[PDB]
Amino acid sequence: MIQRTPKIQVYSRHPAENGKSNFLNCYVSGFHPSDIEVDLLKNGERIEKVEHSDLSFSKDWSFYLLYYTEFTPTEKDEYACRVNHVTLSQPKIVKWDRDM
């Protein structure tokens, strides 16, 4: 390593309530170098209107970024974040748990 693998959190901006406007967030942090691939998935498929913040970094020089999209949760719509980075064997995938 002079390449750190990204930590990944998936979470909503507001406490989820089904059939109510929200934002799905994928926070990737702690990674180096700065090239990284983030997709937000719904039921396994790629959401196209996705935005991310400006590229920044922590005092240890590691980068971070928030990927986000408007959405409306439902009782079992399955949302997740898929992340590729040169430190990973293959894309890393994190399901959205509305309790975390």
Partner 1 sequence: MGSHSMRYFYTSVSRPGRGEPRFISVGYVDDTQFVRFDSDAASPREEPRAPWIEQEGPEYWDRNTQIYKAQAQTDRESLRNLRGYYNQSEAGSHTLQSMYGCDVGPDGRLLRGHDQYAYDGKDYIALNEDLRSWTAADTAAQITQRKWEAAREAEQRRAYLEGECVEWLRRYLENGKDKLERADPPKTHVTHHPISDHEATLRCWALGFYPAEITLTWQRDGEDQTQDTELVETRPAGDRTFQKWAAVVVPSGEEQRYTCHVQHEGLPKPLTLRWEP
Decide: is 56 part of the binding site for partner 1 (CB under 8 A).
yes
The count of residues interacting with partner 1 (CB under 8 A) is 29
Of the candidates 59, 42, 46, the one whose C-alpha atom is nearest the C-alpha of residue 96 is 42
Q: Are residues 36 and 85 in contact, defined by beta-carbon separation less than 8 angstroms?
A: yes
- The SS3 call for residue 10 is strand
Start-to-end CA span in the chain (Å): 29
Kindly tell me which of 57 and 88 has the beta carbon lying closer to partner 1: 57
Interacting residue with partner 1 among 6, 16, 27, 83 (CB under 8 A): 27
Decide: is 80 part of the binding site for partner 1 (CB under 8 A).
no
- The SS3 call for residue 91 is coil
Select from 29-37, 38-46, 77-85, 87-95 the region that touches partner 1 (CB under 8 A): 29-37
26/72 Cα distance (integer angstroms) = 16
> Which residues contribute to the site for partner 1 (CB under 8 A)?
2-4, 7, 9, 11, 13, 15, 23, 25, 27, 29, 32-35, 53-57, 59, 61-63, 66, 68, 99-100
